[PDB]
Design an enzyme around this catalytic site. Structure first.
Site, PDB file in Angstrom:
ATOM      1  N   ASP A  82      27.506  19.266 -28.532  1.00 13.93           N
ATOM      2  CA  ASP A  82      26.831  19.607 -27.246  1.00 13.93           C
ATOM      3  C   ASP A  82      26.200  18.347 -26.643  1.00 13.93           C
ATOM      4  O   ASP A  82      26.489  17.252 -27.155  1.00 13.93           O
ATOM      5  CB  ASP A  82      25.829  20.756 -27.405  1.00 13.93           C
TER       6      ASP A  82
HETATM    7  C1  LIG Z   1       9.292   8.168 -34.182  1.00 13.30           C
HETATM    8  C2  LIG Z   1       8.845   9.481 -33.588  1.00 13.30           C
HETATM    9  C3  LIG Z   1       8.090   9.325 -32.296  1.00 13.30           C
HETATM   10  C4  LIG Z   1       8.436  10.350 -31.251  1.00 13.30           C
HETATM   11  C5  LIG Z   1       8.035  11.751 -31.619  1.00 13.30           C
HETATM   12  C6  LIG Z   1       9.029  12.808 -31.216  1.00 13.30           C
HETATM   13  C7  LIG Z   1       8.406  13.995 -30.530  1.00 13.30           C
HETATM   14  C8  LIG Z   1       9.393  15.020 -30.042  1.00 13.30           C
HETATM   15  C9  LIG Z   1       8.760  16.300 -29.567  1.00 13.30           C
HETATM   16  C10 LIG Z   1       8.810  16.495 -28.064  1.00 13.30           C
HETATM   17  C11 LIG Z   1      10.203  16.571 -27.532  1.00 13.30           C
HETATM   18  C12 LIG Z   1      10.671  17.968 -27.259  1.00 13.30           C
HETATM   19  O1  LIG Z   1      10.728  18.829 -28.102  1.00 13.30           O
HETATM   20  S1  LIG Z   1      11.136  18.217 -25.580  1.00 13.30           S
HETATM   21  C13 LIG Z   1      11.816  19.894 -25.633  1.00 13.30           C
HETATM   22  C14 LIG Z   1      13.322  19.882 -25.676  1.00 13.30           C
HETATM   23  N1  LIG Z   1      13.887  21.189 -25.381  1.00 13.30           N
HETATM   24  C15 LIG Z   1      14.443  21.507 -24.208  1.00 13.30           C
HETATM   25  O2  LIG Z   1      14.888  20.656 -23.440  1.00 13.30           O
HETATM   26  C16 LIG Z   1      14.509  22.978 -23.860  1.00 13.30           C
HETATM   27  C17 LIG Z   1      15.785  23.344 -23.150  1.00 13.30           C
HETATM   28  N2  LIG Z   1      16.940  23.267 -24.033  1.00 13.30           N
HETATM   29  C18 LIG Z   1      17.969  22.458 -23.816  1.00 13.30           C
HETATM   30  O3  LIG Z   1      18.056  21.753 -22.814  1.00 13.30           O
HETATM   31  C19 LIG Z   1      19.100  22.459 -24.841  1.00 13.30           C
HETATM   32  O4  LIG Z   1      19.027  23.637 -25.646  1.00 13.30           O
HETATM   33  C20 LIG Z   1      19.212  21.186 -25.712  1.00 13.30           C
HETATM   34  C21 LIG Z   1      19.772  21.537 -27.095  1.00 13.30           C
HETATM   35  C22 LIG Z   1      17.834  20.551 -25.916  1.00 13.30           C
HETATM   36  C23 LIG Z   1      20.139  20.158 -25.065  1.00 13.30           C
HETATM   37  O5  LIG Z   1      21.019  20.824 -24.112  1.00 13.30           O
HETATM   38  P1  LIG Z   1      22.551  21.125 -24.522  1.00 13.30           P
HETATM   39  O6  LIG Z   1      22.568  22.511 -25.135  1.00 13.30           O
HETATM   40  O7  LIG Z   1      23.327  21.051 -23.225  1.00 13.30           O
HETATM   41  O8  LIG Z   1      22.934  20.041 -25.513  1.00 13.30           O
END
Ligand SMILES: CCCCCCCCCCCC(=O)SCCNC(=O)CCNC(=O)[C@H](O)C(C)(C)COP(=O)(O)O
Ligand code: SF4
Ligand code: SF4
Lengths: 112, 181, 165, 385, 140, 87, 80, 54
Positions: F43
């Protein structure tokens, strides 16, 4: 530079998610030298750790929640790089490097 | 230029959609605006000849957990030209970003960083928005009502690692809450 | 502007005249008496209101003044006071535990103000530095010892200060 | 541009001062202060205290100007309670506010002088500070954290003979300032270190929320004791000095003159001091005398309530500011009708002043950074809270 | 008639052709305000005090009398206000905040709880007559 | 002699191994022409991961607009075999 | 002999010259006053009994108030 | 009680708060003439001492 406005829709928000994933994961070689993790963990294992955190929130549909999560992710990343608090087996929030689960908990304490 | 003039003059000259509430009292004149009009209202107050609200005294948040918009952002402002003070407030929740007024008042920079640090309210167009008061890597916003007084972690020196380390808190004597109500 | 006033500043600059007064006034205090206190033979002045080491007092009969009202515990801004109490064998309302963490305490005197029987007081002693953290966890017996040692001075200060509170 | 990290972990410059400077040679291009090293969670802690228990916290914000913050908190509480303060308490509160201003200016001027290599004035000034700290101790029993100014008045009345001792101090203090000036004012090294350093225009001072000497140095006639007077300040004569250049040298001269005017106020307060009660007589927030608590049932009940539950403050919110030695010190107090403040936001002038270090120190030399910090008169207790 | 040496305000330069500058600014302001709707209270208020100040600047050729009659700081300060009002006019055209919305609702609270005399209180004193003239013009 | 490019076959090999080792990629559908989304079951989040896994292996940063025209094994190998910064 | 290594004690001996003995406590510490005006008329000090190993805590409560100018009563008058 | 700390009858004596002037110091010309004359006479003395040394 400045804090952007809230993302209008999920295309905008998910685009911002990939830039954060790129920026956070590109800094793994800097993190490896800062915490001296050469003999501790492979770069790919920390890459998969960041991806796993992003996937665990794949069910979020509000773009404003996604924007806040990315902003907190950038801050978590910046503190890890700029002001490192080196423990041994963790960086920040993440650990680095025949009975069911009831008896183990029962033998430990009465508070589960 | 007393508080009666400002209340009456502002009602006549301000755009109607900018203000939702207006309070005249000895505790301070107070305009309650919507989030999308906060920036424009403050620009009007600063630039207009009959107000000349040139000094931003401070910006502070207040937590109201019983409200659907729990946070209240309070702007305290001063007009040295007319020797008067004005209060402008707006509401926000944990995910709604609000406009930054650094372009209007440079002093807002650190105060907006403190609001974000203490409450978790984010500010659109803020040039450098990061925590300013808490320790690096801090989790949570301590001025929220639900945040525990002693927090979640404490620090100590660990000789085997030869460094200062963070661990979950363990109090010898817990904080005693006395209910006098 | 004028050859005289031009000459005036040129000589004042070259001859460092304004630095002469700086030297002159630095030398005047040299031959004057010093204000240094010869500690510990000599001490600095203090008032009867001075807030120092805590002490628990007794009546002249030897009975404790404290009746375990817990007002001092409730008012203490640092939560430095811990009290336990029960009825004594003779029916008296007395504490079985009275602890003051001298490392939490902010030496505000609020406990002394709250006490209705003049049992807890901040005495005049300020020289009680210790080599261990433990010794600064004062228990009831230590506080009553302090009151026995400092009773004559405490009673005198209380008499002098009674006209104000 | 290289980055010079400067944290003096010692009270040569504030003890917890931490500066990240971007330099082009010896010229500063950007000064970024890192703060929070003294963040103690005061505002969070206050929400867990009664209004009386929260008062000592204000002594420890600007720990060089203790009683000034006591005064601001008491005025804010009095504002919400609509509490009448007797006249004798008002004169005492103003008298010790001006004593506090001298105590503050003496430390701010001579620690700054010590940082630029003038070591003698600090010793001469701290001896005068000791005489003034003795007056703190005689009224409250504490050298610094007096907790003497309280809602409704002051904790106790002046001890007998204190006014005479204060008058003796005033008869010689003008000579002490004269000696401080002779060591600094005309000296060409002192002028070369301060003149045209850290110039602030009036518009810049307003934009960055500057106040106090930081604002009056730029020619703006603004003093809260005259703009929004409180206690007995409207019945006292004093002049408000203003600058004409907006530089470190102007603000030095203003602090000297403010000390002279503070001496003027103290003398007037000493002569105009009326007799009477020093606590407000509304038996709702004023502790009873020790004799009545031990003789009258109503007084004992009131004493029990005041020291266990404290007094309640009807639900409201207001901002109260005073002219503290370092500038406008403000308190945004939110009450919800209970005996504990719902929210207490502290407005520290040093928070705004230290934020102005970046534009003030632009294109100066490395050795001028300490001078500009000294002219801002920073104490990190109030900056960080 | 004597030229001003200093304004006493750091960073506020002396403007020797102040009357001329004010006349130009006031005339510009009176022309740009017409893009605001006629019924808007902001338009009426700006026209009210700009016209009076313009009248005073035209009548008096001496800047000392312009400051005396107007009673609002120095002419250099008056110029800053005129420049700021021009800037605000342009921003209000861009914002287009005029008109009352359909379901408009505003809550006015008049809390009459008194405060003690001794607590800090701003008492600026009486404004120049024109401020009260603008206000009663706006109300009617 | 000094070279300024990685050999195409050697790149084809390095890219083939990177894509296969990435989990959820069975070493059966990985042909030099195989597409990430349509033919590999990866994906968008998995697809961006592969591209930056190519950045780590070859030690250079791919501009994003190129990171997007890398949807298959040809497009990636076409890019790395002609990029001088590849090592 | 203690004056040579201990300069703190020597200062007291020099300043003891011409002073009036006020009293002696149960530990043998001697209390002196001058009745002048040099540090604002504060001329009270104690000569500890132990010429070595003297300590500020060795001053008893009855003389502590006199020594710190808290009261004008000497230790003898408080004990009576 | 009925006795409170305050001013004496008539108040305390007036105190000065303004800076006091001080006119101590010689004059541009006096110190110049001194230096010039010392230089001239002293260099003549240097010549005399050099003659005796020779
Ligand atoms: C070294 C460490 C330092 C950094 C720390 C890391 C912290 C991370 C925590 C914050 C980040 C998040 O969770 S940000 C939240 C991320 N989730 C979303 O975006 C919700 C919507 N979902 C989607 O877009 C898809 O299911 C997806 C599979 C994501 C892709 O799309 P595809 O399905 O088309 O591949
Ligand atoms: S002095 Fe203050 S902090 Fe210390 S025990 Fe008494 S009330 Fe508590
Ligand atoms: S010391 Fe006083 S206030 Fe504290 S419990 Fe005993 S009697 Fe009550």
């Amino acid at each position: 530079i400045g804090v952007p406005p809230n993302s209008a829709n999920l295309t905008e928000a998910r685009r911002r998610v990939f830039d954060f994933f790129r920026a956070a994961c590109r800094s793994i070689p800097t993190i490896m030298d800062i915490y001296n993790l050469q003999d501790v963990v492979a770069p790919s294992q920390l890459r998969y750790a960041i991806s796993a955190q992003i996937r665990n929130n794949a069910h979020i549909t509000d773009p404003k929640v996604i924007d806040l999560l990315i902003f907190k992710g950038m801050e978590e990343l910046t503190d890890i790089v700029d002001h490192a608090k080196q423990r041994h087996h963790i960086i920040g929030q993440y650990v680095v490097g025949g009975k069911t689960d009831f008896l183990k908990n029962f033998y430990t304490s009465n508070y589960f | 230029m007393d508080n009666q003039f400002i209340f009456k003059y502002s009602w006549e000259t301000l755009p109607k959609k900018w203000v939702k509430k207006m309070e005249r009292s000895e505790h301070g004149n107070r305009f309650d605006t919507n989030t999308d009009y906060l920036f424009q209202l403050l620009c009007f107050l600063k630039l207009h000849t009959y107000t000349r609200v040139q000094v931003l005294i401070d910006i502070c948040g207040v937590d109201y957990p019983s409200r659907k918009r729990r946070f209240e952002v309070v702007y305290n402002l001063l007009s040295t030209r007319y020797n008067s003070r004005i209060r402008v407030q707006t509401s926000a929740d944990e995910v709604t970003r609000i406009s930054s007024v650094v372009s209007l008042f440079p002093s807002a920079g650190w105060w907006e960083r403190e609001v974000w640090d203490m409450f978790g309210v984010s500010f659109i167009n803020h040039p450098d928005l990061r925590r300013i008061l808490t320790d690096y890597g801090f989790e949570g916003h301590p001025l929220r009502k639900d945040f525990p007084l002693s927090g979640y972690v404490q620090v100590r020196y660990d000789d085997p690692e030869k460094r200062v380390v963070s661990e979950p808190i363990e109090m010898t004597q817990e904080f005693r809450y006395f209910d006098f109500a | 502007k004028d050859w005289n006033t031009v000459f005036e500043r040129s000589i004042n600059t070259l001859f460092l005249t304004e630095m002469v007064r700086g030297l002159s006034l630095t030398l005047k205090y040299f031959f004057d008496p010093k204000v240094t206190i010869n500690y510990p033979f000599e001490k600095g002045p203090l008032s009867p209101r001075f807030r120092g080491e805590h002490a628990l007092r007794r009546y002249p009969t030897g009975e404790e003044r404290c009746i375990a009202c817990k007002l001092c515990e409730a008012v203490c801004p640092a939560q430095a006071i811990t009290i336990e109490a029960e009825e004594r064998e003779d029916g008296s309302r007395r504490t079985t535990r009275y602890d003051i963490d001298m490392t939490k305490c902010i030496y505000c005197g609020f406990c002394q103000e709250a006490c209705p029987v003049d049992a807890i007081v901040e005495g005049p002693n300020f020289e009680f530095a210790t080599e261990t953290h433990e010794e600064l966890l004062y228990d009831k017996e230590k506080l009553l010892e302090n009151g026995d040692r400092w009773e004559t001075e405490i009673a005198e200060n209380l008499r002098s200060e009674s006209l104000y509170r | 541009n290289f980055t010079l990290n400067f944290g003096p972990q010692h009270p040569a410059a504030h003890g917890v001062l931490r500066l990240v400077l971007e330099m082009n040679g010896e010229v500063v291009e950007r000064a970024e202060p890192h703060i929070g090293l003294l963040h103690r969670g005061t505002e969070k802690l206050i929400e867990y205290k009664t209004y009386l228990q929260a008062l000592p916290y204000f002594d420890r914000l600007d720990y060089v100007s203790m009683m000034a913050q006591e005064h601001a908190y008491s005025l804010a509480v009095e504002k919400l309670l609509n509490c009448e303060v007797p006249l004798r308490a008002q004169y005492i509160r103003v008298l010790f506010c001006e004593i506090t201003r001298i105590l503050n200016h003496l430390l701010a001027l001579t620690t700054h002088a010590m940082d630029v290599g003038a070591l003698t004035p600090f010793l001469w000034a701290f001896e005068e500070r000791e005489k003034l700290l003795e007056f703190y101790e005689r009224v409250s029993g504490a050298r610094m954290h007096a907790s003497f100014i309280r809602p409704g008045g002051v904790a106790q009345d002046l001890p007998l003979g204190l006014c005479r001792d204060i008058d003796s101090f005033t008869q010689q203090f003008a000579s002490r300032i004269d000696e401080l000036e002779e060591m600094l004012t005309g000296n060409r090294i002192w002028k070369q270190r301060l003149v045209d350093i850290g110039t602030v225009t009036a518009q810049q001072a307003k934009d960055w929320g500057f106040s106090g000497v930081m604002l009056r140095g730029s020619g703006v006639c603004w003093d809260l004791r005259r703009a929004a007077p409180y206690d007995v300040y409207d019945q006292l004569d004093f002049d408000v000095p203003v600058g004409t250049r907006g530089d470190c040298y102007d603000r030095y001269c203003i602090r000297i003159e403010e000390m002279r005017q503070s001496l003027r106020i103290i003398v007037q307060c000493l002569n105009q001091m009326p007799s009477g009660m020093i606590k407000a007589d509304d038996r709702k927030l004023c502790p009873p005398s020790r004799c009545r608590m031990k003789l009258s049932m109503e007084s004992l009940i009131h004493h029990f309530e005041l020291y266990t539950e404290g007094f309640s403050v009807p639900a409201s919110s207001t901002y109260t500011a005073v002219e503290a030695p370092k500038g406008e010190f403000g308190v945004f107090l939110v009450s919800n009708g209970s005996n504990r403040p719902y929210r207490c936001k502290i407005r520290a002038p040093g928070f705004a002043h230290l934020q102005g270090l970046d534009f003030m120190s632009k294109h100066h030399m490395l050795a001028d950074v300490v001078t500009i910090i000294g002219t801002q008169d920073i104490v990190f207790g109030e900056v960080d809270r | 008639a004597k030229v001003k040496q200093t304004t006493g305000i750091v960073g506020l330069d002396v403007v020797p052709n102040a009357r001329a500058v004010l006349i130009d600014l006031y005339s510009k302001t009176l022309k740009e305000i017409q893009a605001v709707p006629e019924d808007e209270g902001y338009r009426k208020a700006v026209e009210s005090f700009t016209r009076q100040r313009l009248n005073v600047c035209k009548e008096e050729e001496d800047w000392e009398m312009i400051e005396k009659r107007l009673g609002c700081g120095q002419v250099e300060e008056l110029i800053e206000e005129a420049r700021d009002e021009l800037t605000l006019i342009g921003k209000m055209i861009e914002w287009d905040p005029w008109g009352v919305p359909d379901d408009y609702e505003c809550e006015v609270i008049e809390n009459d709880a008194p405060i003690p005399k001794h607590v800090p209180q701003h008492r600026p004193g009486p404004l120049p007559e024109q401020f009260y003239k603008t206000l009663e013009g706006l109300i009617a | 002699v000094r070279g300024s490019f990685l050999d195409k076959s050697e790149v084809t090999d390095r890219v083939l191994s990177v894509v296969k080792n990435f989990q959820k990629v069975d070493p059966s559908k990985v042909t030099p022409k195989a597409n990430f989304q349509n033919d590999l079951g990866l994906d968008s989040l998995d697809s961006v991961e592969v591209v930056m896994a190519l950045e780590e292996e070859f030690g250079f940063e791919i501009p994003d607009n190129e990171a997007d025209k890398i949807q298959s094994i040809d497009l990636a190998v076409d890019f790395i075999a002609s990029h001088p910064q590849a090592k | 002999m203690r004056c040579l290594p201990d300069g703190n004690l020597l200062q007291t001996k020099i300043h003891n010259i011409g002073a009036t003995l006020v009293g002696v406590d149960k530990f043998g510490n001697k209390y002196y006053q001058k009745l002048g005006d040099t540090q604002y008329g504060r001329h009270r000090w104690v000569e500890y009994a132990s010429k070595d190993r003297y300590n500020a805590s060795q001053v008893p409560a009855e003389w502590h108030g006199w020594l710190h100018f808290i009261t004008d009563h000497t230790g003898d008058e408080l004990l009576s | 009680p009925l006795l409170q700390d305050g001013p004496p009858p008539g108040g305390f004596a007036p105190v000065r708060y303004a800076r006091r002037i001080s006119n101590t110091g010689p004059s541009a010309m006096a110190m110049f003439l001194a230096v010039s004359g010392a230089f001239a006479w002293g260099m003549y003395q240097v010549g005399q001492g050099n003659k005796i040394r020779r």
